[PDB]
Amino acid sequence: VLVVTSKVKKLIKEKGQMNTSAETIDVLSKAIEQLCLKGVESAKADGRKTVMARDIVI
Amino acid sequence: VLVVTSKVKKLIKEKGQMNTSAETIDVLSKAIEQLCLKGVESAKADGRKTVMARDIVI
């Protein structure tokens, strides 16, 4: 799991009075994994050894 | 911070032999915050009290 589950659930509850399903946590974690892997692609294509904010295309 | 920093850095290092900048962590966390808030919008518009995977549009 790549998201901080407790903090995600807190944000959703305090900002929306919403509960958070388990599958929501899974999708968020998968989204982080994909952003990271695309970031690696971008950084390497640029000949760099560090993934930077400009590599996280959002 | 809404991402698990240590686990993000591990993924990027093990999958890309890349380092991870601090600003990368910040962008990932901001992305999670925005996905969560959009998820609250979608769930509430549907009259629900739980943010579900279908509310996280990725």
Residue numbers in the entry:
A (entry chain A), B (entry chain A): 4 to 61
Sentences from the paper on this structure:
In this study, we present crystal structures and biochemical characterization of the free and DNA-bound forms of the histone homolog HBb from the predatory Gram-negative bacterium Bdellovibrio bacteriovorus. Our findings demonstrate that the single histone fold protein HBb forms a homodimer that has the ability to bind and bend DNA. Furthermore, we establish that HBb is essential for maintaining bacterial viability. Building on this, by employing various biophysical and biochemical approaches, we further substantiated the ability of HBb to bind and compact DNA by bending in a sequence-independent manner.
Crystallization trials were conducted with purified HBb, and within a few days, we obtained crystals that diffracted to atomic resolution. Except for the first three and last three amino acids, the full chain is clearly resolved in the electron density map. The asymmetric unit contains a single chain of HBb, forming a dimer through crystallographic symmetry. HBb exhibits a characteristic dimeric histone fold, with monomers consisting of three α-helices (α1, α2, α3) connected by two loops (l1 and l2). Dimerization occurs through the antiparallel alignment of the central α2-helices of the two monomers at an angle of approximately 25°. The dimer is stabilized primarily by hydrophobic contacts along the interface, involving residues L31, I35, and L38 in α2, as well as contributions from α1 (e.g. V11) and α3 (e.g. I59). In contrast to the archaeal histone HMfB, the α2-helix of HBb is one turn shorter, and α3 comprises only a single helical turn. Like HMfB, HBb features a conserved intramolecular salt bridge, known as the RD clamp, involving residues R51 and D58. In HBb, this motif is augmented by D49, which forms an additional salt bridge with R51, potentially stabilizing the conserved KT motif in loop l2. Four of the six DNA-binding residues in HMfB, including K52 and T53, are conserved in HBb, indicating a potential for DNA binding.
